[PDB]
Amino acid sequence: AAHLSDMLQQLHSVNASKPSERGLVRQEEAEDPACIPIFWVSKWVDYSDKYGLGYQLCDNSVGVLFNDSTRLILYNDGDSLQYIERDGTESYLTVSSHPNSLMKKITLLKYFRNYMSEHLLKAGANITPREGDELARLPYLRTWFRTRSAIILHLSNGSVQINFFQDHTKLILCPLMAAVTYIDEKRDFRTYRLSLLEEYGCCKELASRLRYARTMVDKLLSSRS
């Protein structure tokens, strides 16, 4: 909510600057590879009719947002878990500890994990994420929704990812860095500081996707509240 309103302001500001109408567009001068995200969604699978939405983060951790609004996350060590209930209660445990209260959901999570590992490509596989406190909280998927053109994924660290179905382009927006990472059709990745994009401008494709992004963040804030 705090991070989302900040994201909305940052997007309203860049779009208000009409970055694609600059007489001298200099997109490259808005890049800042130091702002590369730590986390993004590399895979997802929509089983919402029965169980929920499963996903994998670029660090090979997996998570599930169950239909009952709980979330279960399995770290990339294959054993550490974080469970978040609908009221917000979080717990840390291990699969190997055999938690009686969670074996069904662990089994479902493992089903999701095996589906994605065998069938799906890893988004951003050509990217080494930024170095953070590898030591600090793994985010979880706070909410998601689909439109006819994209899937919108909102992470608990405030990031918002939008994957476009038609051309496989993707945006990863981070309100903490006020940055956007754009993955184009050719899977080339560029990270921009939004404030620099306002000075230097950008191409019509990125400008259009950023207008769409503002609309989706607007929808995210409205549904939350």
Partner: peptide, 5 residues
């Protein structure tokens, strides 16, 4: 789409 690429 029911799943990513």
């Amino acid at each position: 789409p029911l799943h990513s690429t």
